[PDB]
């Protein structure tokens, strides 16, 4: 079972200058509670953006050139990245945009964070067909001190 997990502000924007333009601690905490204790696959750009291994998670990184970090696994094809993860209930594609474009067909589950926000961005979440996806869960939170914008977690299922 392969899952994508992301945070999309309006017009499906996911990043700007190899960052996420928002800082929502409750999103980074959602992301953790779900990804924790399971393989995470990511692109090199995103590995740099994060720029540290995520504890708990076996970190697996997609790049066509040799690895520059010994404490994470490095891989060159989609299948190599899957095999890396092992025999597990659930895999977690944690980004970025070019990775999501490739891992959606094999995906059976989405974890979106819908963000009530208008940001400029260079990177977009793919265009998922709201037919082939069934919303199995939703949860809206208001803007608070730390969480500058309102947001809503959604899980979908193929
Ligand atoms: N919550 C969110 O919305 C979220 C989560 C993650 C990412 N982001 C944002 O998304 C953006 C990432 O943009 P991006 O799409 O350029 O990042 P990316 O997906 O991290 O970068 C993909 C890179 O991974 C490698 N790669 C991917 N598939 C490969 C394959 N099949 N074979 C070989 N190498 C492969 C390539 O690196 P090589 O050049 O080394 O070959 C490729 O350039 C950033 O702005 C980031 O902040 C935000
Ligand atoms: C733990 O920190 C990061 C996590 C992520 C991945 C990620 C984070 N949140 C959500 N909802 N989906 C994701 N795929 C992406 C990041 O930068 C692009 C991070 O650095 C702040
Ligand atoms: N919007 C929905 N309720 N879709 C139903 C799920 C469709 C399913 N993913 C096919 O295959």
Residue numbers in the entry: 1 to 158
Which passages does the manuscript contain on this structure?
Two plasmid-encoded dihydrofolate reductase (DHFR) isoforms, DfrA1 and DfrA5, that give rise to high levels of resistance in Gram-negative bacteria were structurally and biochemically characterized to reveal the mechanism of TMP resistance and to support phylogenic groupings for drug development against antibiotic resistant pathogens. TMP is a selective inhibitor of bacterial dihydrofolate reductase (DHFR), which catalyzes the NADPH-dependent reduction of dihydrofolate (DHF) to tetrahydrofolate (THF), a necessary step for the recycling of reduced folate cofactors. Trimethoprim resistance in Enterobacteriaceae occurs almost exclusively through the acquisition of plasmid-associated dfr genes that encode intrinsically insensitive DHFR enzymes. Expectedly, all three enzymes form the stereotypical DHFR fold with an eight-stranded β-sheet, four α-helices (B, C, E, and F) and three catalytic loops (the Met20, F-G, and G-H loops).
Crystal structures of EcDHFR:TMP and EcDHFR:NADPH:TMP, determined to 2.5 Å, and 3.0 Å respectively, show that the binding affinity of TMP is driven by electrostatic interactions between the protonated diaminopyrimidine ring and Asp27 as well as van der Waals contacts between the trimethoxyphenyl ring and helices B and C (specifically, the side chains of Leu28, Phe31, and Ile50). Furthermore, the antifolate adopts a nearly identical conformation when overlaid with chromosomal DHFRs from other prokaryotic species, including Gram-negative (Coxiella burnetii)57 and Gram-positive (Staphylococcus aureus)46 organisms. Accordingly, when we titrated TMP with a preincubated binary complex of EcDHFR:NADPH, a highly cooperative binding event with an apparent KD of 11 pM was detected (>2000-fold difference). In the presence of TMP, the KD for NADPH shifted ~100-fold to 8 nM, demonstrating a marked enhancement in cooperativity. Overlay of the EcDHFR:NADPH:TMP and DfrA5:NADPH:TMP structures shows the D27E substitution lays the foundation for the divergent binding orientation of TMP. The additional methylene unit in the side chain of glutamic acid results in a 1.4 Å reorientation of the carboxylate head group, subsequently pulling TMP further into the active site by 1.1 Å.
